[PDB]
Amino acid sequence: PKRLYCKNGGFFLRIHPDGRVDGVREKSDPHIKLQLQAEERGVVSIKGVCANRYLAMKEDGRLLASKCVTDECFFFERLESNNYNTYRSRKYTSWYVALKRTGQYKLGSKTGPGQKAILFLPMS
Ligand SMILES: O=[Se](=O)([O-])[O-]
Ligand SMILES: O=[Se](=O)([O-])[O-]
């Protein structure tokens, strides 16, 4: 039952009950309480405990939380050499889950390696 914490400005990923995703800096916020369920080695599912919705990635780089379980609910997780974690799309091979430093998620299509934006540290 972890929260994820962005390197890019220190925001936790927030999942809204309506599907909308973003960041906030309030650890006490309930919509930041996640469930990361590993499904194979290195492949996880991050779900919103409260929202009861799964993080999904859309064809256009779009990030949102859906009820439905599909192959877009999936992310190869990864411990970076710097000890931050990364979730890149199992479907959209090149796409990473990311938060802009202002707090809005960043288009998957505009991510890539080397970005702070992509850098997460999960916590209980
Ligand atoms: O982190 Se950001 O907003 O893409 O510069
Ligand atoms: O300004 Se920064 O460190 O490249 O995100």
From Swiss-Prot:
Localized where?
Answer: Secreted; Nucleus
Cite the post-translational modification comment. Phosphorylation at Tyr-54 regulates FGF2 unconventional secretion.
- Location in chain, cross-link Glycyl lysine isopeptide (Lys-Gly) (interchain with G-Cter in SUMO1): K67
Identify the domain of life.
Answer: Eukaryota
Query: Mind telling me which residues the site (Important for interaction with integrin) is annotated on?
Result: K100, R101, K106
Residue interval(s) of motif Cell attachment site? 18-20, 60-62
Q: In which tissues is it expressed?
A: Expressed in granulosa and cumulus cells. Expressed in hepatocellular carcinoma cells, but not in non-cancerous liver tissue.
Q: Where is this region: Heparin-binding?
A: 100-116
Tell me the residues on which Phosphotyrosine occurs.
Y54
Q: Where does heparin bind?
A: N8
The UniProt similarity line reads: Belongs to the heparin-binding growth factors family.
Q: What does this protein do?
A: Acts as a ligand for FGFR1, FGFR2, FGFR3 and FGFR4. Also acts as an integrin ligand which is required for FGF2 signaling. Binds to integrin ITGAV:ITGB3. Plays an important role in the regulation of cell survival, cell division, cell differentiation and cell migration. Functions as a potent mitogen in vitro. Can induce angiogenesis. Mediates phosphorylation of ERK1/2 and thereby promotes retinal lens fiber differentiation.
In the UniProt entry for this protein, what further remark is given in the free-text comments? This protein binds heparin more strongly than does aFGF.
* Subunit structure comment from the entry: Monomer. Homodimer. Interacts with FGFR1, FGFR2, FGFR3 and FGFR4. Affinity between fibroblast growth factors (FGFs) and their receptors is increased by heparan sulfate glycosaminoglycans that function as coreceptors. Interacts with CSPG4, FGFBP1 and TEC. Found in a complex with FGFBP1, FGF1 and FGF2. Interacts with FGFBP3. Interacts with integrin ITGAV:ITGB3; the interaction is required for FGF2 signaling. Interacts with SNORC (via the extracellular domain). Interacts with glypican GPC3.
Q: What is this protein called?
A: Fibroblast growth factor 2
Lineage here is: Eukaryota, Metazoa, Chordata, Craniata, Vertebrata
Q: Which residues of the full protein are shown?
A: 162 to 285 of 288
